């Protein structure tokens, strides 16, 4: 009942898909200049 | 001026570069397809046949105990079901992936057709011995491809295995 997950197999999509996308995002994240900006928002992208 | 057939002219691309050449390409298959691909095929068919001929003879005289005794061709059927068939197909297919890579190399001209570089017992001592043997193989492959076809059709009709038929001719 925790996410409507009555069958363990339902947890394979709820984890693998967010991880995989995050993996695509990690490459975007590694390409960014990640030093601190003293600003309202970061214009470096 | 084909040597094998004096009358017909030598087919244009059969010039004796490959051994086993008597100019016999009457229907001109040589011109339409790459000769190199064809030699690969001559030997590859020949190699299966030269082996199969041995097998029909051996399978008749002796069969391993664990397999039921059957006539050589009958077995294509039991083995389709025991599952031995798949194994012999899986492996001969695996060897063949490498064969596709080998062919593409022949087409790029980097491999002599029919050469898998297998001479483990090193029988080929000299470049002449290679030419002698290489011709012998091409002759045996041609004889065997004919004979295996015979062993099978004669059985389809006589319903007798080849050695048995020779013993009891049992003419139609």
């Amino acid at each position: 009942e925790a996410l409507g997950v009555d069958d363990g197999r339902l947890l394979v999509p709820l984890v693998l898909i967010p991880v995989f996308v995050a993996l695509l995002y990690g490459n975007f994240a590694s390409t960014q200049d990640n030093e601190d900006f003293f600003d309202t928002y970061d214009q470096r992208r | 001026f084909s040597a094998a057939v004096p009358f017909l002219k030598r087919p244009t691309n059969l010039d004796g570069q490959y051994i086993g050449d008597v100019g016999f390409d009457p229907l001109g298959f040589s011109d339409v397809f790459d000769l190199r691909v064809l030699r690969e095929a001559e030997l590859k068919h020949g190699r299966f046949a030269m082996l199969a001929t041995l097998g029909f003879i051996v399978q008749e005289l002796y069969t391993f105990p664990f397999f039921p005794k059957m006539a050589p061709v009958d077995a294509h059927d039991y083995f389709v079901k025991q599952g031995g068939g798949s194994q012999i197909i899986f492996w001969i297919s695996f060897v063949e992936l490498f064969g596709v890579v080998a062919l593409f190399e022949t087409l790029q001209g980097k491999r002599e057709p029919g050469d898998f570089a297998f001479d483990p017992l090193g029988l080929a001592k000299d470049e002449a011995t290679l030419e002698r043997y290489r011709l012998a193989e091409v002759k045996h492959a041609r004889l065997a491809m004919i004979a295996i076809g015979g062993f099978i059709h004669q059985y389809w009709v006589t319903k007798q295995t080849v050695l048995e038929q020779l013993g009891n001719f049992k003419s139609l």
Partner: protein, 35 residues
């Protein structure tokens, strides 16, 4: 019923993850006044 549920969960998780990580990809910088 399980297969429809797993397909729906896969689709919803994919789209929600795309939304979440897209708005995490420095969305404020995607304005015409950014230099």
């Amino acid at each position: 019923m399980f297969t429809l549920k797993i397909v729906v969960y896969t689709t919803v998780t994919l789209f929600v993850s795309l939304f979440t990580f897209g708005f995490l990809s420095n969305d404020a910088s995607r304005n015409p006044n950014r230099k």
